[PDB]
Symmetry: D3
Subunit: 157 residues, 6 copies
């Protein structure tokens, strides 16, 4: 009955994201990972690549599935009969910005947002910083799942 959506661009998914997925899947009957695509800007990975990397690293979460979308997150959530979003947060700065979006989403669609504190070990990994570090040759193998790391290096080379 209960369910939540875990949104992001996941370009690529990180171990921080996977931690959030696992924690959501432990507390809700179903979890949908929403891979939100900007039809106007391509990321590093195509939609099918992003989804494949997430599926490979969530194979042991039976109540989680992965779907892409675009436009308003609250429409994605509501069209699946749900009304909760779960998002990871690292800092107070994160909270202030995400707060605005959560209150807007509640206002326009009645959708609630639950935030979870990042695991300490992954508090400094982000998709953007991992890509930037890897671009200039830094070692990010411990911050990304196996389903991501060598595909990332491949994209960069």
């Amino acid at each position: 009955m209960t369910g939540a959506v875990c949104p992001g661009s996941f370009d690529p998914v990180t171990l921080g994201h996977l931690d959030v997925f696992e924690r959501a899947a432990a507390q809700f009957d179903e979890v949908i990972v929403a891979v939100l695509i900007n039809p106007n800007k391509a990321g590093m990975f195509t939609v099918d690549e992003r989804i494949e990397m997430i599926r490979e690293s969530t194979a042991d979460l039976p109540n989680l599935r992965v779907e892409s979308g675009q436009g308003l997150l609250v429409d994605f959530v509501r069209e699946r009969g749900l009304n909760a979003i779960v998002k990871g947060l690292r800092t107070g700065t994160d909270f202030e910005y995400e707060l605005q979006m959560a209150q807007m989403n509640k206002h326009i669609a009645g959708v609630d947002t639950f935030f979870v504190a990042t695991a300490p070990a992954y508090s400094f990994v982000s998709s953007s910083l991992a890509k930037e570090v890897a671009t200039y040759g830094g070692d990010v193998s411990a911050l990304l799942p196996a389903s991501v790391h060598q595909r990332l290096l491949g994209k960069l080379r």
Copy 2:
């Protein structure tokens, strides 16, 4: 069967707290509001008074129950077969202190914490500020459940 604990002193419960209770009860199969008994610093209302005020304000939430608790919160949570805490947050500063507690609770007992952003209208209400304003004659009736407000005036006489 999903579930979460909503902990606090609730001295007294505010409309901000109630908003959190409602949103938790909408997303989890069971919610337990845990009312802290604090041996040292006593407050304005007894634990039984606080429990009754919450029960009156949550009468329409059939999957929410109210209980007193003492000591280590994660013991309270695990003793009831649960492993999630739900708390409301108002500010970035709130997030930083609560994040420390959440990471500590996950480390020592595997209990997770979900945070929800305050409804905008209650971003500035707290039990402590409401009591202080009311003590000096300010009108806080729009910030508290109807019953709380009547009981609060009683304690002040």
Copy 3:
């Protein structure tokens, strides 16, 4: 006794959050000037932005609306004033605006007064309102009634 402040912004479009700040500034200063930045890529033209603000502030007799360019402190000083009034939502806002406020005081002796957002508008911004409306979300409760139909026009 010739008190006055300037309320600056791009106002693309003006929101109820902005209007709340204008009203509060107008209640505490003899003269308020809303300064609409010309910074030519926005949704509305500078003239359209000025009109929407004038429409929404008709009940504020001591407020006027003017366009401006360049250093804000020059705009303020050339009108004989030396105060800016700005609304703030978060501590993050305060830290960024703090830098600009201290710079403005340093270079021109112009002071900045910040006012806390009304709770109901803590989450509205011109940018988020435009984004939500663009994908069909209802923002009518967040914008002046006039602005709202004008926005519908730009999209449809």
Copy 4:
């Protein structure tokens, strides 16, 4: 035209950071009242705190100093005003003061204007100044000249 604001605090003692805020408030409002809280454990008596502020604000003709108790908004409204002016150093400050500002607006319609600290006084507070002086640190550059000798008196 009857503009006015109240600058509240314990001022135990008043610092150059506070005085900077008083001066800036006095420059932008016709009338400024400094409200000195009676909250009986401080270092100086309410009378002493009032005297130190009056001594330091002699060049501010439109400022007066009064003691107060209870709800700040009652102090403000009973003097016919509905604005508070408060200085702010950090984003953390803003978040805490934001709650009080929104509460005060809610219960009494009293607005709050915040001003950014002068950079030179970003680190001074009554409490830190007292603490440092107590252990022999030189805080003379952080306090009004009058206050400084008075502080030396309380310690020696």
Copy 5:
């Protein structure tokens, strides 16, 4: 020639503090850990106990020594012919508060302060939170050095 002081109450020292000590000892010729004592409030551990717990967990840092003091930190620093303080920081909130003290210390004595970001794993441990959790029976064995944990449990029992 170069040197820094690492101050705190260290009541007790945590793994977060030890991380800071090690990082300071790697970058300065000498490091002094300053155990600052409030002569008006006893902590959990006496001064000699605090120093002993720090020495036992820093035995492999040859350029580090431990001394107690009270009063102005900048006097402790200057009387040893030094003029740098090194302190760990976890959050932006920490930085704002410590910033005030660092600027005051520079103002009154010319002493500089260098801050270092906490290691991610210890970002949620503090002496106060470890004591509080342990008081109510929570497991904090992974957050404190061996020189501390059982002595803490002993104090509590």
Copy 6:
């Protein structure tokens, strides 16, 4: 032999930067100021111009040298036999973003970062804001080294 790298674009160097350089040079045996060459986004001054402005402003710092750098900062640092970065901080928000970078740099290369709080007088100056103010005729001469100011006026004509 202790040492640290002070990295940045310094376009142009401000009195805030110089304060950081001075404080680093006072506490480390060697300081290297690393001036970023950025292939994409160019700025107002060439790398050689930026280096010369820093050299003129740091003429009294014999243990500080200035060099251009590109790519991964921790490679620059380790290539010079060092493993410390020193950066100035103005705000809590600054700390949060820089903390992510510092933890990342420590993770991928074992390079540590020490932060110093801005002198109060320069808390509001930045290269970007100084240029913007100067472009429209504002006087920023009290915020920049004397030589920078002369060169800045030249670029604006």
